Amino acid sequence: EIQQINIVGNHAFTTDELISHFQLRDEQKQKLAGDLETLRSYYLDRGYARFNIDSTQVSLTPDKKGIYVTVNITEGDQYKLSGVEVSGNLAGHSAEIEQELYNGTKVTKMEDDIKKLLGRYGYAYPRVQSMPEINDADKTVKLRVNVDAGNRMSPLPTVENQFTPTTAWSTSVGSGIGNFYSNLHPALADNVVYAADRAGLVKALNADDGKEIWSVSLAEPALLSGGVTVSGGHVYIGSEKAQVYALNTSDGTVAWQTKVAGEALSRPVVSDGLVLIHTSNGQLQALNEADGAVKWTVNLDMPSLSLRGESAPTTAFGAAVVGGDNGRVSAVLMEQGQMIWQQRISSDVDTTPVVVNGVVFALAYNGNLTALDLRSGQIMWKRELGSVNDFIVDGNRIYLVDQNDRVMALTIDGGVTLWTQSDLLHRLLTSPVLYNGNLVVGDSEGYLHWINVEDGRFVAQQKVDSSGFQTEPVAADGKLLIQAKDGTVYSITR
């Protein structure tokens, strides 16, 4: 099963229609090549010579099947036919064969007729190769045709919970991310909650009240996937349509918009007048806070099957430590993204380092959870547990969620386990956060599970929203928040 096919760089035609001829919505690499050519054929049939497919990316959600496809193109300009030239060993049929917008099909259609016409005369294996001669100066294509002739999921567990948690408020935010593996999640700063819908809708809510204070549509679905960050009175959101938006907290009006190299899936991190983004084409990118202009850009590298991403960095004194596939951490200085050191920690993909302090903590799908030297890249120690979802380092420990919705407290020193909870196995769980000294996380069936940190046992268990959970629970300013797949945003209170 595949969840989505995307096209990035497509401004002439709308995405859903070029796709519509794709034979790939179906439940495999062999055919994608077939459809990359439908993609081309389609542009070359509309005079878009000098059209290019830069990158093709196959992704797979953490739940072990929800294949994602992204086709990064760079759309050419329009070119008309300047004329036709017919050359080669025809050589006396040169008059019978020789007798608008550039149509790649028509050309190839032409080819076949030239290839077939000689076929009537017994030329069984003649080969023609027609190259478009282009001048970008006046945007026209001259077609030249040389020719050679033929020779002739585990259940819930029971829980005795005191406390009883309880929802303080709920406010709708469109149709949410749905099953689309997003990273979108609320954010709070100075008392307003900023959440968004994958379609484009963005809302700002009273934290204490839960009531809109401004709403805006950023649409052509925006396809928001990375967010929501907040810093310096801005609201940074990245979309799968390769666009990063910065909004004023006050009116929710677009401060700036930046074209990015690819799908901005990661949460944007704002340290030091910057916004670091990780794109699905393995691009780490920095842009100014005020104008959103690209300062530097680094190609991390990427494989054929991958995350659904992307590792969002940490800032450690003018370094960005970022992971992502290939499956190795990359620490780059901030102006201008010069590789210092790259250490492999290893489907080898990766997720957000924590730095506390001079030591980097990484996790990758499959093995493994690493602790690293910030300044040199050494591995101080390791494990064989991972997931592509985040992990907090409160105190001298590490509370993670494992590949299989396992839960673990491990020391900061050793990743010697203290405890493990495993009754939520394969329940498709969120990232872990502490709220009032208790570890809280949600799952695809809607509950939020409050686990204590001394032992591993559920102190509480609740049902908030049948639609399910997938995105980070956000705990800040004594307020816990989480947003569902349906889009509904919640503020829980004990």
Swiss-Prot record:
Read off the CDD domains from this record: PQQ_DH_like
Q: State the UniProt keywords alphabetically.
A: Cell outer membrane, Lipoprotein, Membrane, Palmitate, Signal
Q: Does the keyword Thylakoid apply?
A: no
GO terms assigned for molecular function: identical protein binding
Question: According to its UniProt record, where is this protein mainly located?
Answer: membrane
Q: Which Gene3D superfamilies match?
A: YVTN repeat-like/Quinoprotein amine dehydrogenase (2.130.10.10)
The keyword Lyase is annotated on this UniProt entry: no
Q: Where in the cell is it found?
A: Cell outer membrane
What domain of life does the native source organism fall in?
Bacteria
Q: Name one Pfam family in it.
A: PQQ_2
Q: Which InterPro entries match?
A: BamB, PQQ_b-propeller_rpt, PQQ_rpt_dom, Quinoprotein_ADH-like_sf, WD40/YVTN_repeat-like_dom_sf
A Gene Ontology biological process in which this protein takes part is: Gram-negative-bacterium-type cell outer membrane assembly
Could you give one GO CC term from the UniProt record?
Answer: cell outer membrane
Entry's PANTHER family? CELL SURFACE PROTEIN, OUTER MEMBRANE PROTEIN ASSEMBLY FACTOR BAMB
Give the protein's biological function: Part of the outer membrane protein assembly complex (Bam), which is involved in assembly and insertion of beta-barrel proteins into the outer membrane. Nonessential member of the complex, which may orient the flexible periplasmic domain of BamA for interaction with other Bam components, chaperones and nascent outer membrane proteins. Efficient substrate folding and insertion into the outer membrane requires all 5 subunits.
Protein's name according to its UniProt entry: Outer membrane protein assembly factor BamB
Q: What is the lineage of its organism?
A: Bacteria, Pseudomonadati, Pseudomonadota, Gammaproteobacteria, Enterobacterales
